[PDB]
Ligand binder design. Structure first.
Ligand SMILES: *[C@@H]1O[C@H](CO)[C@@H](O[C@@H]2O[C@H](CO)[C@@H](O)[C@H](O)[C@H]2NC(C)=O)[C@H](O)[C@H]1NC(C)=O
Ligand SMILES: *[C@@H]1O[C@H](CO)[C@@H](O[C@@H]2O[C@H](CO)[C@@H](O)[C@H](O)[C@@H]2O)[C@H](O)[C@H]1NC(C)=O
Ligand SMILES: *[C@@H]1O[C@H](CO)[C@@H](O[C@@H]2O[C@H](CO)[C@@H](O)[C@H](O)[C@@H]2O)[C@H](O)[C@H]1NC(C)=O
Ligand SMILES: *[C@@H]1O[C@H](CO)[C@@H](O)[C@H](O)[C@H]1NC(C)=O
Ligand SMILES: *[C@@H]1O[C@H](CO)[C@@H](O)[C@H](O)[C@H]1NC(C)=O
Lengths: 80, 39, 49
């Protein structure tokens, strides 16, 4: 008994998402975009999610990553 | 209307991929297939 | 020709052309995945590409 994916869909990717002077690589899953806003989703299914500070781990300088894309990450600590 | 013909083999269906610097293809559905194997 | 097909399936779609349909992916990201498989994070590759 096996599992087989189906029904693919083209998207747009980016290695990282640069917030204020940092890199913010994802923890698990790609960084995909619809055509407007960026989301983080799994690798074998399509479950988009908002880019919150618990889905991404941050380490960098926003200078050495080739192909980085500008977007804002969210955090549940500033609100509360 | 029936006869025997000779042809060269076809290795498979002709297909090409669409590689690019920024493009992903993420499935949004699956299937379950049950194969068999005899030994 | 078979060898070329197997080789060209590896560099544009990673290992996804083995299980089912072939899904495109950039080579730096595929290498980041393979590095993640070893047990080292992606940032090391993205800093020393
Ligand atoms: C992505 O965002 C960064 C910062 O968020 C931008 O960096 C700017 O760089 C220019 C040129 O050195 C400076 O004049 C600006 O002050 C920087 N921005 C900030 C907020 O300090 C960078 O240009 C952005 N990239 C794109 C393509 O828009
Ligand atoms: C990007 O992803 C968005 C999801 O937040 C989609 O936004 C849509 O926006 C309309 C209003 O403008 C909403 O009514 C709708 O429910 C949805 O949230 C957007 O479609 C998507 N981009 C593309 C190109 O599909
Ligand atoms: C994923 O693929 C399934 C079949 O491979 C789809 O199920 C089908 O659902 C229709 C009714 O919508 C049935 O008539 C059909 O027999 C089959 O069960 C399933 O919908 C599909 N998922 C999505 C999100 O499209
Ligand atoms: C992605 O776009 C290419 C461009 O022609 C197309 O061939 C391919 O089928 C698309 N992928 C899909 C629809 O999953
Ligand atoms: C990817 O980037 C390189 C940078 O030199 C460019 O030459 C190439 O055309 C890009 N890929 C596509 C499909 O345009």
């Amino acid at each position: 008994v096996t599992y087989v994916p189906a029904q693919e869909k083209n998207f747009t990717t980016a290695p990282a998402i640069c917030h204020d002077g940092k890199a913010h690589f994802p923890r698990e899953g790609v960084f995909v975009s619809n055509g407007t806003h960026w989301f983080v989703t799994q690798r074998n299914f399509y479950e988009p999610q908002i880019i919150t500070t618990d889905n991404t781990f941050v380490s960098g300088n926003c200078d050495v990553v080739i192909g980085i894309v500008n977007n804002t990450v969210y955090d549940p600590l500033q609100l509360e | 209307s029936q006869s025997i013909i000779a042809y060269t083999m076809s290795l498979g269906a002709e297909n090409s991929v669409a590689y690019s610097n920024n493009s992903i293809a993420i499935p949004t559905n699956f299937t379950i297939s049950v194969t068999t194997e005899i030994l | 020709q078979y060898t070329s097909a197997l080789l060209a399936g590896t560099i544009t779609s990673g290992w996804t052309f083995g299980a089912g349909p072939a899904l495109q992916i950039p080579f730096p990201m595929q290498m980041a995945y393979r590095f993640n498989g070893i047990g080292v994070t992606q940032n090391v590759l993205y800093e020393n590409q």
